[PDB]
Amino acid sequence: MVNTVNYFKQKLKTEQQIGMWVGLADGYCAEIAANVGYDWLLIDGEHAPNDVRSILAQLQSIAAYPSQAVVRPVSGDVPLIKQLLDIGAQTLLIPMVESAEQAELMVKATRYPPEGIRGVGAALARASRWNNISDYLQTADEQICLLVQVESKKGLDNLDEILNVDGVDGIFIGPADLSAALGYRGNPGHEFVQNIIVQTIQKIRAAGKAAGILSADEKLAKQYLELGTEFVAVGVDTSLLMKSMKQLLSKFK
Amino acid sequence: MVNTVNYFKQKLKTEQQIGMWVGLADGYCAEIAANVGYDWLLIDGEHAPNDVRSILAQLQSIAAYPSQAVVRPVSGDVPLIKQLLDIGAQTLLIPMVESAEQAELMVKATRYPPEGIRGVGAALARASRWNNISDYLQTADEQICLLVQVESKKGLDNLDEILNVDGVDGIFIGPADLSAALGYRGNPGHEFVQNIIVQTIQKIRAAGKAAGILSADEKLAKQYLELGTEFVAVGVDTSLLMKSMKQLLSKFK
Amino acid sequence: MVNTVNYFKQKLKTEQQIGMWVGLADGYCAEIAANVGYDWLLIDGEHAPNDVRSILAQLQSIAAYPSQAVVRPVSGDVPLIKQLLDIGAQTLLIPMVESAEQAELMVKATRYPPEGIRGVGAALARASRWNNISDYLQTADEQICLLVQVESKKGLDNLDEILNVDGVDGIFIGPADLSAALGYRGNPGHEFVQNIIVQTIQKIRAAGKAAGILSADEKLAKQYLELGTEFVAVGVDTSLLMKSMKQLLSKFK
Amino acid sequence: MVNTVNYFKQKLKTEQQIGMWVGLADGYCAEIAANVGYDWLLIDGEHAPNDVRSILAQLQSIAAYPSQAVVRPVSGDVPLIKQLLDIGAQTLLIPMVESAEQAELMVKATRYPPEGIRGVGAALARASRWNNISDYLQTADEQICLLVQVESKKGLDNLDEILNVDGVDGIFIGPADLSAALGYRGNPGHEFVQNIIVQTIQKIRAAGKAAGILSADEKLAKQYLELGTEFVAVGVDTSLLMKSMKQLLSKFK
Amino acid sequence: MVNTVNYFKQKLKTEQQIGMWVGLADGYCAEIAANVGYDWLLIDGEHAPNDVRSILAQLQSIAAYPSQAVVRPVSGDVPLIKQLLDIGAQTLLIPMVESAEQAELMVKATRYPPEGIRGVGAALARASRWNNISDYLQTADEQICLLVQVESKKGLDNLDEILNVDGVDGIFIGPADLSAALGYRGNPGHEFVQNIIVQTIQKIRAAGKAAGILSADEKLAKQYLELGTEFVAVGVDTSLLMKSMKQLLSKFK
Amino acid sequence: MVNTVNYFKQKLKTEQQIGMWVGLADGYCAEIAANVGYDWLLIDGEHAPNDVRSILAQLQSIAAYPSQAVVRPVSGDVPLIKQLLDIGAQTLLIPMVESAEQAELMVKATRYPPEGIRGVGAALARASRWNNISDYLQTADEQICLLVQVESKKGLDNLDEILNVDGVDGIFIGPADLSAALGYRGNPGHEFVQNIIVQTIQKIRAAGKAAGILSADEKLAKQYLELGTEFVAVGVDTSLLMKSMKQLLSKFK
Numbered sequence A, B, C, D, E, F: 001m002v003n004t005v006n007y008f009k010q011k012l013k014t015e016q017q018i019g020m021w022v023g024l025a026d027g028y029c030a031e032i033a034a035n036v037g038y039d040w041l042l043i044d045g046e047h048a049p050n051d052v053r054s055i056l057a058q059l060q061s062i063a064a065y066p067s068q069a070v071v072r073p074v075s076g077d078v079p080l081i082k083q084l085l086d087i088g089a090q091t092l093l094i095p096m097v098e099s100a101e102q103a104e105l106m107v108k109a110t111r112y113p114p115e116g117i118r119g120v121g122a123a124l125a126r127a128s129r130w131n132n133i134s135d136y137l138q139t140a141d142e143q144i145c146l147l148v149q150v151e152s153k154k155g156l157d158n159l160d161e162i163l164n165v166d167g168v169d170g171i172f173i174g175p176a177d178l179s180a181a182l183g184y185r186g187n188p189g190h191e192f193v194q195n196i197i198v199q200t201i202q203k204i205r206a207a208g209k210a211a212g213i214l215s216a217d218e219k220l221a222k223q224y225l226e227l228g229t230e231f232v233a234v235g236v237d238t239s240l241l242m243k244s245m246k247q248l249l250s251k252f253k
């Protein structure tokens, strides 16, 4: 078997990928999302009740479908990154990255020694399909994609430095965390926040990196796509479930 | 503690209750549905991948909310009915009921000896809150609600006989199973099927029983409500999730 | 490896075994019970929310401890008996047995062909420790113990016939189900019920079978032990947990 | 989406399919087996500790790989067959089939009304991918494969009658159950048993049905393949795990 | 929906709240405890085998009952605090707090930016009921209660400094950890330890903070209540289960 | 009850113990391994998808068998070490230990105050069997065994310093991590790596500590045993399962 090709990673340079957030934290719900045709599915280990084992179940569900899996760990924790790579997550989204030094450590966390610090345990791992991918230890590093979130004042204060880190494939903007950091908690739609987001997207793309963002607002998402933003998540499974059930009830009250 | 009052059962005689089908088979998804404000939630043990333990988890989630839980077992199995009553399901929907003799057996399955055949194990049961409902064995039978599905030719052939069974609180019409039985599989919207459904609702209500049905078609559901149908399910969580995610993607293709 | 010796089965002829009911339905709770020193633990698949997989977990927990495991299935279902024997349950308690013909079928359900109807799948089974017990198919039948419950009027109406069935090792009296059947639901302590229980114990022992019962009433349990009842359950984990937490709170209200 | 094509079913007429028994009862273990390249994987719901939900997890794991999944339910139970079809099992292996009447009922259990009795609940089902397979109710019956086990004297006594049932795609011989039924429990390798198995394979193929069997004996499996047996399972995951770990320890004692 | 009111937090200034430790690590056991009527239930993520997902299940069980849930994470880990707040834990008990600097960080960990560092992910969170609490991001901080444990020499060495931290609602004394730190491991009942505990309770209350403690000793618990201690846990579910089962067996040996 | 004797720890001074790696992450798979007769089983929390709760399940399975359990946490995390000790893991293997200061902290992490920093919560813990081991807090430290991995250049750079730490019972060499660190990723068999491993084994034993290693290569494992290496793992369950299923299929292709 050849290593699973990371089409998400390749498509960062060739197209604009439409994403769905997966916070239902469940192999069965993840399979439903995987049937829709999103370019990418974000398995949220930061803000949904997930652990390594529930994320594994969702990777197994999604694996039968073309949608590419991206996993967000709860934090930039090196041992947790090791665990998520070994269950076979090929793209990671690291929250709250705030310096070039932290971004460099996240690069190393995703690459084998001697160049990186990814723990070596291929025989045991779904990532190597238990060494059924015979040359995994030689071919792994190439299909791993590292995305980092800029979503605080300190992140924006270190944006140019992070954008200079070789091995950061993409910078994703978190409007909820960023709007709160800016003192507009719950109000990312404000011009003050939006002008900072647009400028940030322009700088990311000017430095030759992929830009990404989430917005459930159709108009904002289409604006970000018009700016050339490479990976745009356009909705959240929990939000779509709740809103669809509320809209239906409202027809009958 | 006094036994949990079955408001679903009481409301069969005082109002028209709006229902949501719950097939996501998960305590977390069931809690999301429970926040919307449906009069009743159908935990589907027949067509969703549920067992006694997953149904228990969903009852625990839903219990903090006003929405009344109704459980559909996979079949009219007496021992399975015993298990679902003991985890505390107070309303059951029995699929594919086809005779007065079967309906009478389902009545007995929901009531303690000496009048019924419900196995006695109160001490162990969430139903008695582990005997924290001190008079459970005396007050249980009153808050249990039995609904039976008529959804085959043999069911329609025994409709008058089933409607004469004391202890059947409601007859629910299954348009998917009924349309297939009638040789209109996938096409319940056909006038042939709909005239049989309308006549069936009229007969159920004429015999003094509650009538129920599921339709995701807003126009049909409102027609059934105009006829006086007591319990109408108007949508399905899996369908709402899938359709909402597809409609969103279609805005970006 | 030699087959696990069923010490419960042997001790039916040599001593009076003290039992604890396990309805917490959980490997961790079952292990707590296993540390106490009960002769036998009843893993309740009839009145606690258990399935084959949760019963397996509890058998695995208990297996490190001297306490002997007895499993109650939800009903005398032949395929479910097959499943519980293959996960390695060596003693089964069948509820609501009401005829010699049903007791004979339960005997056959526990024994391999050609003499019985137990499905043969030893290679796959914890029962054979995956053929690590090399002679399992020749030695299995001997360590299997069949107990049947008499707990209805029809059971009492067929008591002499059931007591004549070769392969029934024990008859257990269910006071909750029996008192309800007799029209004393919730009141097994009444003289009418107790005289029937004592007479039933005497008849069981007179026919050379082991007699069993559950009572959380210390005086009744000690009375049953004085009559020579071979297997007496003296409490229930859910009941002891609830009562101990209530008694503690009452000291502080 | 078009309905998933049942390549197992088509290949019953075009080649000899090599199978692996999956009794480890776990999505992660099922995925390991799925990487090997077996034509088919038997998810054992009869002799491994599986339920609908654990079988679902294994179907989800296996679905990303070419290996075709076959599910054995604990018995020919119509409602359980309904559940296993709805989670998306397209091939079923029914144990202990003993008459034309039982085989006909298993045929109906796998087909929608009006011709069959399969319960209609497509909207909710992984089988329809929650109606993402738009014409599922018209195209389902064609990709369902029914296999029945002949593995008792009564099965052999009704072999010609079972072989005349339209809708039975395959007859599988169970050497463990059959050798026990014949009074050679644990000794299927005996000439008495083997001549009956060979004769049975010849009769199955002469009636135009697919023949199947399990043997972990390489010589017996190759003999069955030389006779033209269409679906041959050649090993069991639990057995291969135990034997490989024992053989390794023996090198070091 | 308005944000769930934290009655535990309000009652810290109006009454003395009686608590039960919940270490059975299970939604079903947590529900049993929730029926008793304790003012508060401590879901132990430090010394019972719990993770985010098992703590979620227990919050869901408890949510239907008046008992207020308090969650102890394994350590003062900022990302784990984020996870436990998002599943809807409104009161946290942080173990082994040893400085004003660590207590200040725990305050920030529980509050949204710009004043705190709680990660913003309301849409996804049971805490917001998936934005069904429409103003959650404005009303969340007010219903969050922060308790910190002083249970080491360094904690006692920094007691006055911790008691001056705005945002610490309560200091809880850990007699097991504290007695071990003092070189009286397993002997918290010693006068040396008890005089330090009493002095510590007096200092906590004199600084205007709530004092808390656990003791399964009825006399010690009543002494702590007489001193005015605001939140007193009086027992542990695992201990009450084990002791009740041992005391029962001892009546029969 | 007296504390469980750690026979693994005692046998480090009396014999050479043969080990099996357990990465199938499952109580049922762990029990299969437990039946084989390995001296020790490594429950891998670093490179298999395990958490505290799945490791607990595997400890419960294994506990009925003579095989000694060793648990590898994901990293030398003090709170996670506390959790694994409380579920009753008596031997820990800490990955990627690189200094005397880190080894000393791991020693303290495994011992109660006042000498160590192990959090005290015995009442709640399977480790004390919920205080059924009445003197657990006095007898625990003696049956705890600490192993550390040297598997990086920094580890080898601090080998003499680590070997001087009182309370390190064993140093385990990780050939996958070490060969990668040395720029021979995937090629530990090279003479450059092997000479370093042999020298390292000699230095460990010369300092009076137990030496350990894993090799699935029978010749290398036997060479390590001839050098007197005290704890040698000779295979991995995932590897043996995959290889045995592949070898079987190759006989039939």
Ligand SMILES: O=Cc1ccc(O)cc1
Pocket (backbone or CB within 6 Å): A120, A121, A122, A123, A124, F021, F047, F174, F176, F214, F216, F236, F239
């Ligand atoms: O610990 C990591 C590891 C690496 C390769 C193996 O074969 C087994 C374990």
Ligand SMILES: O=Cc1ccc(O)cc1
Pocket (backbone or CB within 6 Å): B120, B121, B122, B123, B124, C021, C047, C174, C176, C214, C216, C236, C239
């Ligand atoms: O088996 C049912 C049962 C009833 C009451 C109890 O207390 C225990 C068990």
Ligand SMILES: O=Cc1ccc(O)cc1
Pocket (backbone or CB within 6 Å): C120, C121, C122, C123, C124, D021, D047, D174, D176, D214, D216, D236, D239
């Ligand atoms: O189907 C049961 C069975 C029996 C023996 C085996 O080796 C495998 C399966």
Ligand SMILES: O=Cc1ccc(O)cc1
Pocket (backbone or CB within 6 Å): B021, B047, B174, B176, B214, B216, B236, D120, D121, D122, D123, D124
């Ligand atoms: O009960 C089955 C069912 C069928 C179709 C639906 O849309 C919902 C439920």
Ligand SMILES: O=Cc1ccc(O)cc1
Pocket (backbone or CB within 6 Å): A021, A047, A174, A176, A214, A216, A236, E120, E121, E122, E123, E124
């Ligand atoms: O990542 C956090 C998040 C916040 C709000 C959303 O709607 C979705 C995700």
Ligand SMILES: O=Cc1ccc(O)cc1
Pocket (backbone or CB within 6 Å): E021, E047, E174, E176, E214, E216, E236, E239, F120, F121, F122, F123, F124
């Ligand atoms: O927090 C730990 C703890 C210690 C002893 C107990 O009895 C209960 C909890």
Ligand SMILES: [Ca+2]
Pocket (backbone or CB within 6 Å): A051, A053, E051, E053, F051, F053
């Ligand atoms: Ca978990």
Ligand SMILES: [Ca+2]
Pocket (backbone or CB within 6 Å): B051, B053, C051, C053, D051, D053
């Ligand atoms: Ca289950």
Ligand SMILES: [Zn+2]
Pocket (backbone or CB within 6 Å): A095, A149, A151, A174, A176, A177, E120
């Ligand atoms: Zn964010």
Ligand SMILES: [Zn+2]
Pocket (backbone or CB within 6 Å): B095, B149, B151, B174, B176, B177, D120
């Ligand atoms: Zn139907």
Ligand SMILES: [Zn+2]
Pocket (backbone or CB within 6 Å): B120, C095, C149, C151, C174, C176, C177
């Ligand atoms: Zn009973």
Ligand SMILES: [Zn+2]
Pocket (backbone or CB within 6 Å): C119, C120, D095, D149, D151, D174, D176, D177
């Ligand atoms: Zn068979």
Ligand SMILES: [Zn+2]
Pocket (backbone or CB within 6 Å): E095, E149, E151, E174, E176, E177, F119, F120
């Ligand atoms: Zn403490």
Ligand SMILES: [Zn+2]
Pocket (backbone or CB within 6 Å): A120, F095, F149, F151, F174, F176, F177
């Ligand atoms: Zn390593």
